[PDB]
C-alpha cells in the first residue's frame, strides 16, 4: 500500500539530510505520536565539534500510522524554513531505527513553560502569540495546514523564542485549499474547528480556530480548554453555538480576537496576517 | 459526520450504572483505573472493578474507539473475554466498568517471572478458545498481543481491548483504507501491505503472541526497526526458534505466519494442537 511504497522509495534515496549514526549520541527522554530524546551531534552540517540537538524517533511498537507520520514530518521539515518553525538538521535512516535530528528548545513546550510561571507580562504573552502567528502565516503561504496547533506543540527555544513543532499531521493543500480526512482524525477534539469535528474538513481557517484555542492556553498560562467538559459534549455545545467564557487576566481585545477565531463560518474568521496586526495593536498599548 | 451521528444516538438500558455509586482509585495503565462499585448488577455492597475512560485530550478517533469497545462488549460473553458490567454517560465523562484482573497484563505478568511450559501452553489455549468464540461471532480482533491480554483471579486469561475490533459478518474481511494503529510487529503481511484484516490475520497475531508467551514477554523481532519488516516479511523471513521452545510449539508459530492466509491453521485447530501439547 501507500506506506510500503513510501518505505521502499525512502530507503532507496538525499545526502543533503543523511547524518552518520556514529556521530550521534543519545541522552535522556524529553517527551512522548513520537518520542524525543536530548542528543549531541558531532560535526553536524558544518558546525565544528558537538551541538546539542533533539532527536525525534518512533516509540516502542510503532503502528503503520506512526511510521507514516514520522516520514511525513521528515518530508515537511525539509521544505520549511522560518525563525518560528523548528529546524531540521538531518536524519539517520541507514542501519538502525529512523531518527530525525532537530533543533533543541531549551525551555521545552510552551505549555510546560506557561505552567511553570506566574514572571511574565501580558506583553510577553502577546509576543509569544505574535511569533506563532508569523510562523502560521508562512506555513499558510507554503500551502500547508498544520492541523495540530496547541501549546503542547509549540516549543520555547533559547531567548524565549517560539518554535512551531510536530508536523506529523500537516497536509499539503496546494491544489484544493482543503484537506479532507475520511476516517476519524487524531487531533484532540477540544482544539478542532467545528467543520473539522463534523465534516472532517481542514483548512487554514481551521488552523485559525486552533490558534484561538491556543490564545486561550496562552492567556490562562496553560489552562485546560473547556475545563470539566467531556470531549463528547463538544459536538452539541459547538453547533448550539457555545464558546469558552472570557478567562481571568484576559483583556477585552484579546478575548474579542479568540471569539473571532471561533466564528462558525470559516470565511468569517481572521487570516493569520489580521491576527498578527491585531496582536501588534495590543502590543502597542503595552510597549 | 459518523461520530457526531453516533454520539447523538448514544446519548438519545441495563448497562447504565449511576455515577455516584462508583469510586475511582489509582491508575492501572494508559486509560484504565482501579475502582469500586456499589450495588453493581445485583451484587450487594462493593465490588472491585476496572474503569476504562478517555485520556486527557482525546481525539475523535479515541472517542470512536471507546464507543466501539462498549458496543462490542455489550455483545460478547465468554470465560476468557473480559466482562463488561456497565457504563456511566448520563453526566461527566464516559466510563466503562469492566472486570478487574488482579495480575494485570499478560506481558507484565510474564516479565515478572516460576512457571512451567504447562502453565504457558494453558495460557495460549485459554486465549485460543476465546479467539475461537470471537471468530464464531464473526469478530476480527486485530490487536491481539500479550499487553492486551489480562491475567485475572486463578491466573485466568482475559482477552481485552476491543477498541479496534471489527464486525465481519457480511464480507468476512475488514479493509482499512488509511493506516492502522496496530503495531507493525503484530500485523499479518496482508494487513501490512494490503490493509486486509480477517480471522486469519488474528491467527498471525496469535502466532506473535505465542512467541511472547514462550519468551516470557520478549520483544518481537528484537533490534529490528518496524520499517524493515515490510521487506523482511515479503522476502520470507520469520523469527527464529526462541530458547526453551518445543519443536511442536515453534512449528505452530510458523504455521501461524504462513504467507498465505488460507494455509494458516484456524482457531479451532490451534485449541486442538495446544490441548494435544497439554496432554503430551
Ligand atoms: C528541554 C525540552 C523539553 C522538551 C519536551 C523538549 C522537546 C523538544 C526539543 O527540545 N526539540 C524538539 C523538536 C521537536 C519536538 C520536541 C522537541 N525539549
Ligand atoms: C491490576 C491491574 C493492572 C492492570 C494494568 C490492570 C488492567 C485491567 C484490569 O484489571 N481490568 C481491565 C479491563 C480492561 C483493560 C485493562 C484492565 N489491572
β-partners of residue B140 are: B166
Q: Are A174 and A76 in contact (CB under 8 A)?
A: no
Report the nearest-CA residue for atom 18 of ligand 1: A108
Domain layout of chain A by residue ranges: 8-104, 105-284
**Could you tell me which residues come within 8 angstroms of residue B116 by beta carbon, excluding any fewer than 6 positions away?**
none
- Interface contact B183-A63, CB threshold 8 A: yes
Q: Are A86 and A77 in contact (CB under 8 A)?
A: yes
Query: Per the structure block, which three cell numbers stand in for A167?
Result: 508536523
Most B CBs within 10 Å: which of A235, A238, A240, as the mutation test of the B interface? A235
- CATH fold for the domain made of A8-104: Phosphorylase Kinase; domain 1 (3.30.200)
Q: Are A222 and A115 in contact (CB under 8 A)?
A: yes
CA distance, residue B280 to nearest chain A CA (Å): 35
CATH class of B8-100: alpha beta
Report the nearest-CA residue for atom 2 of ligand 1: A108
Query: Per the structure block, which three cell numbers stand in for A39?
Result: 542528543
Q: What is d(CA B73, CA B5) in angstroms, rounded to the nearest whole number? A: 20
Q: Are A215 and A257 in contact (CB under 8 A)?
A: yes
Q: What is the DSSP string of B202-258?
A: HHHHHHHHHHHHHTTSPPSSTT--GGGHHHHHHTT--PPPPTT--HHHHHHHHHHT-
Three-class DSSP category at B144: coil
Q: Tell me whether strands A35-44 and A47-57 are parallel, antiparallel or unpaired.
A: antiparallel
Q: What is d(CA B184, CA A66) in angstroms, rounded to the nearest whole number? A: 10
Tally of CB atoms within 10 A around A29: 10
- The finding on whether B203 has its CB within 6 A of some atom of ligand 2 is no
Q: Is B42 exposed, middle or buried (0-12, 13-18, 19+ CB in 10 A)?
A: exposed
**What are the backbone dihedrals phi and psi of residue B71, each rounded to the nearest 5 degrees, phi first?**
-65, -35
Nearest CA in chain B to A196: B1
CATH class of B101-279: mainly alpha
In the PDB record, what is the listed experimental method? X-ray
Q: Is A22 exposed, middle or buried (0-12, 13-18, 19+ CB in 10 A)?
A: exposed
Residue with cell 486465549: B127
Number of alpha carbons in the 13 Å side-chain half-sphere of residue B21:
18
Q: What is d(CA A131, CA A152) in angstroms, rounded to the nearest whole number? A: 16
Query: Per the structure block, which three cell numbers stand in for A111?
Result: 505549555
β-partners of residue A37 are: A29, A55
Q: What is d(CA A89, CA A101) in angstroms, rounded to the nearest whole number? A: 6
SS (H, E, C) A246-279: CCCCCCHHHHHHHHHHCCCCHHHCCCHHHHHHHH
Continuous H helices in chain A: 2-11, 64-79, 110-115, 122-141, 194-199, 204-219, 234-239, 252-261, 272-286
Give CA angle at A182 (A181, A187), nearest 5°: 45
- The finding on whether B102 has its CB within 6 A of some atom of ligand 2 is yes
Q: Are A225 and A217 in contact (CB under 8 A)?
A: yes
Q: Is A23 exposed, middle or buried (0-12, 13-18, 19+ CB in 10 A)?
A: middle
Taking CA atoms, A23 is separated from A48, A251, B238, in Å, by 12, 50, 32
Q: Is A50 exposed, middle or buried (0-12, 13-18, 19+ CB in 10 A)?
A: middle
Q: Resolution of this entry in Å?
A: 2.5
User: Best substitution site from B32, B51, B72, B102 to test ligand 2's pocket, by max atoms within 8 Å of Cβ?
Assistant: B32
Q: What is d(CA B174, CA A205) in angstroms, rounded to the nearest whole number? A: 35
Query: Per the structure block, which three cell numbers stand in for A153?
Result: 506543540
Residues with Cβ within 6 A of ligand 1? A 30-31, 36, 54, 56, 86, 102-106, 108-109, 155, 165
Would you state the torsion angle of the CA atoms of residues A153, A159, A161, A166, taken in this order, to the nearest 10 degrees? -30
Residue with cell 502567528: A133
Q: Tell me whether strands A161-164 and A201-202 are parallel, antiparallel or unpaired.
A: unpaired
**Could you tell me which residues come within 8 angstroms of residue B39 by beta carbon, excluding any fewer than 6 positions away?**
B21, B45
Name the DSSP class of B74. T
Q: How many residues does chain B have?
A: 280
The atom of ligand 2 lying closest to the CA of B29 is 5
**What are the backbone dihedrals phi and psi of residue B190, each rounded to the nearest 5 degrees, phi first?**
-65, -30
Number of alpha carbons in the 13 Å side-chain half-sphere of residue A116:
8
CA distance, residue B276 to nearest chain A CA (Å): 33
> Binding site: residue ranges of B?
28-32, 52, 99-101
Cα B101 versus chain centre, distance: 14
**Could you tell me which residues come within 8 angstroms of residue B229 by beta carbon, excluding any fewer than 6 positions away?**
B184, B185, B192, B221
Residue with cell 460473553: B77
A257 in a known ligand binding site: no
Residue with cell 512451567: B116
Taking CA atoms, A242 is separated from A198, A200, A229, in Å, by 15, 20, 12
Q: Are B48 and B40 in contact (CB under 8 A)?
A: no
Q: Are A270 and A278 in contact (CB under 8 A)?
A: yes
CA distance, residue A200 to nearest chain B CA (Å): 8
Name the DSSP class of B77. -
Q: Is B207 exposed, middle or buried (0-12, 13-18, 19+ CB in 10 A)?
A: buried
Q: What is d(CA A32, CA A30) in angstroms, rounded to the nearest whole number? A: 8
Q: Are A275 and A133 in contact (CB under 8 A)?
A: yes
- Would you put residue A105 in left (φ > 0), alpha (ψ -120 to 50) or beta? beta
Query: Per the structure block, which three cell numbers stand in for A89?
Result: 538538521
Tally of CB atoms within 10 A around B45: 9
Q: Are B142 and B165 in contact (CB under 8 A)?
A: yes
Considering the domain A105-284 in this protein, what is its CATH number? 1.10.510.10
Q: What is the DSSP string of A147-198?
A: ----GGGEEEETTTEEEE---TT-EE-TTTS-EE-SS---S-GGGS-HHHHH
β-partners of residue B96 are: B52, B87
Query: Per the structure block, which three cell numbers stand in for A226?
Result: 473547556
Give, for B25, the enclosing helix (H) or strand (E).
strand B22-29
Question: Quick one: which of A85, A82, A81, A36 has its CA closest to A59?
Answer: A36
Q: Tell me whether strands A179-180 and A171-172 are parallel, antiparallel or unpaired.
A: unpaired
Amino acid at each position: 500500500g501507500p506506506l510500503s511504497l513510501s518505505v521502499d522509495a525512502f530507503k532507496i534515496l538525499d545526502p543533503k539530510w543523511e547524518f552518520p549514526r556514529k556521530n550521534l549520541v543519545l541522552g535522556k527522554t524529553l517527551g512522548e505520536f513520537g518520542k524525543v530524546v536530548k542528543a549531541t551531534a558531532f560535526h553536524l552540517k558544518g558546525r565544528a565539534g558537538y551541538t546539542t540537538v533533539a532527536v525525534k524517533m518512533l516509540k516502542e511498537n510503532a503502528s503503520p500510522s506512526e511510521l507514516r507520520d514520522l516520514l511525513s514530518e521528515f518530508n515537511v521539515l525539509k521544505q520549511v524554513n522560518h525563525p518560528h518553525v523548528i529546524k531540521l538538521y538531518g536524519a539517520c535512516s541507514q542501519d538502525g531505527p529512523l531518527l530525525l535530528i532537530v533543533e533543541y528548545a531549551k525551555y521545552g513546550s510552551l505549555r510546560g513553560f506557561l505552567r511553570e510561571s506566574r514572571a511574565l507580562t501580558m506583553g510577553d504573552l502577546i509576543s509569544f502569540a505574535w511569533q506563532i502567528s508569523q510562523g502560521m502565516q508562512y506555513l499558510a503561504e507554503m500551502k500547508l495546514v498544520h492541523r495540530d496547533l496547541a501549546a503542547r506543540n509549540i516549543l520555547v527555544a533559547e531567548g524565549r523564542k517560539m518554535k512551531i513543532s510536530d508536523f506529523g499531521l500537516s497536509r499539503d493543500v496546494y491544489e484544493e485549499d482543503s484537506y479532507v480526512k475520511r476516517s476519524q482524525g487524531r487531533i484532540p477534539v477540544k482544539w478542532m474547528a467545528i467543520e473539522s469535528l463534523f465534516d472532517h474538513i481542514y483548512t487554514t481557517q481551521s488552523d485559525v480556530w486552533s490558534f484561538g484555542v491556543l490564545l486561550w492556553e496562552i492567556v490562562t498560562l496553560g489552562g485546560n480548554p473547556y475545563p470539566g467538559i467531556p470531549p463528547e459534549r463538544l459536538f452539541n455545545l459547538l453547533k448550539t453555538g457555545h464558546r469558552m467564557e472570557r478567562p481571568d487576566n484576559c483583556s477585552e481585545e484579546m478575548y474579542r480576537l479568540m471569539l473571532q477565531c471561533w466564528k462558525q463560518e470559516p470565511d468569517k474568521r481572521p487570516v493569520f496576517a489580521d491576527i498578527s496586526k491585531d496582536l501588534e495593536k495590543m502590543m502597542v498599548k503595552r510597549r
